[PDB]
């Protein structure tokens, strides 16, 4: 399975200028595009090698779409402040996430188009790509406007067609990196925490995609509720890192084993301190 | 490839 996902953020800044609009686009866990409305003469810009050869008409087209979205989001933010009777003195944030998920045959599993305001659900295109869920009575104003204008039909056309087709094209153009797993490089660290306990931490570094499973066992028994897990974080080079830690009685370290599961590992790895 | 449509909330 693969996905393409866009993330839009528009933020008003009363008394410090007009709202700022940022867009990023991902295929799976790999960013490929950005746009920042604060840039002087802003452009859609490549962030992955496999869109750098798309050509100037493509990039002009994406840039045109982002500029229109940035200007429109200024209107939307103003409308929302009016729906809610909010003060012009406060800053507010509009977010949108949209995209498509594909199955192993390249068919569309699910399309998305969800919006948030002030950090919480505002309105969402339903799974059927034909109706809306409004989070409150303000979002119901938007819903009636979008129903009258057949907004859902336009999104469905994009989600079932353009989104699927271009995701498949990006996957083929970038297959050498997008369709290749990078196995995690692993080690265990050890830190006493008192006279009688010690931290064992299992590290996974340099892996792609981000999905990974790190577990600790005591004499073979899973230690699920005693394992502290950090959220998977970016290394900065397109790969990821994660650690999982357990606090154990001093002198009992030898009972514990770390287990690592990743697409890049044909067999799970076991580590011990 | 980004969504081409445009409609205010």
């Amino acid at each position: 399975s693969h996905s393409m996902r866009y993330f839009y953020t528009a933020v008003s800044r009363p008394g410090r200028g007009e709202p700022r609009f940022i867009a990023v686009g991902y295929v799976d866990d790999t960013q490929f595009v950005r746009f920042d409305s604060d840039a002087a003469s802003p452009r859609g810009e490549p962030r992955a090698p496999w869109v750098e050869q798309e050509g100037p008409e493509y990039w002009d087209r994406e840039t045109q779409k982002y500029k229109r979205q940035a200007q429109a989001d200024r209107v939307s933010l103003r409308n929302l402040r009016g729906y809610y009777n909010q003060s012009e003195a406060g800053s507010h944030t509009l977010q949108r996430m949209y995209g498509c998920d594909l199955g192993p045959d390249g068919r569309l599993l699910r399309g998305y188009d969800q919006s948030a305001y002030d950090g919480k659900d505002y309105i969402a295109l339903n799974e059927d790509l034909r109706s809306w869920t409004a989070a409150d009575t303000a979002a119901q104003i938007t819903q009636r406007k979008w129903e009258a204008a057949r907004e859902a039909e336009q999104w469905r056309a994009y989600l079932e067609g353009t989104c699927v087709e271009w995701l498949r094209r990006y996957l083929e153009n970038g297959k050498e990196t997008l369709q290749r797993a990078e196995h995690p490089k692993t080690h265990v660290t050890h830190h006493p925490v008192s006279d009688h306990e010690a931290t064992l931490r299992c590290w996974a570094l340099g892996f792609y995609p981000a999905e990974i499973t790190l577990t600790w066992q005591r004499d073979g028994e899973d230690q699920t509720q005693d394992t502290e897990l950090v959220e998977t974080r970016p290394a900065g080079d397109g790969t990821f890192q994660k650690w999982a830690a357990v606090v154990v009685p001093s002198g009992e370290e030898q009972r514990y084993t770390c287990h690592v599961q990743h697409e890049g590992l044909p067999e799970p790895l076991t580590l011990r301190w | 490839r980004a969504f081409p449509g445009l409609r205010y909330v």
């Binding site: 993330f7 953020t9 933020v11 940022i22 990023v24 991902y26 960013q31 950005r34 920042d36 962030r47 800053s91 944030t93 977010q95 996430m97 948030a116 002030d118 950090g119 919480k120 660290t189 830190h191 931490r201 570094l205 340099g206 950090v230 959220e231 974080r233 970016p234 290394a235 900065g236 080079d237 890192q241 650690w243 | -």
Partner: protein, 100 residues
């Protein structure tokens, strides 16, 4: 509306080895709104050449950003990340700990 305070992680791109060039990262995540102040410090002093990833967000709508700078660690140089956010009354300082 509801504001969420950033989780802060300070770490290197690769396992640190004294004298070998590397990248120092400060990853902030889980915060709202998106306005945030992140500086990398060397021995208490703000580092100048620091860049960051393009603003994005997670399924719960909270934001995340990676700040980073090229650096060559040494045995004695200390590094930290200083973060301020509307949810923070004073800046939070998290030290880089290579032995973690």
């Amino acid at each position: 509306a509801i504001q969420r305070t950033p989780k802060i992680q300070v770490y290197s791109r690769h396992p640190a080895e004294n004298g070998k060039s590397n990248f120092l990262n400060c990853y902030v995540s889980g915060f709202h709104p998106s306005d945030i102040e992140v500086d990398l410090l060397k021995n208490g002093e703000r580092i100048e050449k620091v860049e960051h990833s393009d603003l994005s967000f997670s399924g719960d709508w909270s934001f995340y950003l990676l700040y980073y700078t090229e650096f060559t660690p040494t045995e004695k140089d200390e590094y930290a990340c200083r973060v301020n956010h509307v949810t923070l009354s004073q800046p939070k300082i998290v030290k880089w700990d290579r032995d973690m």
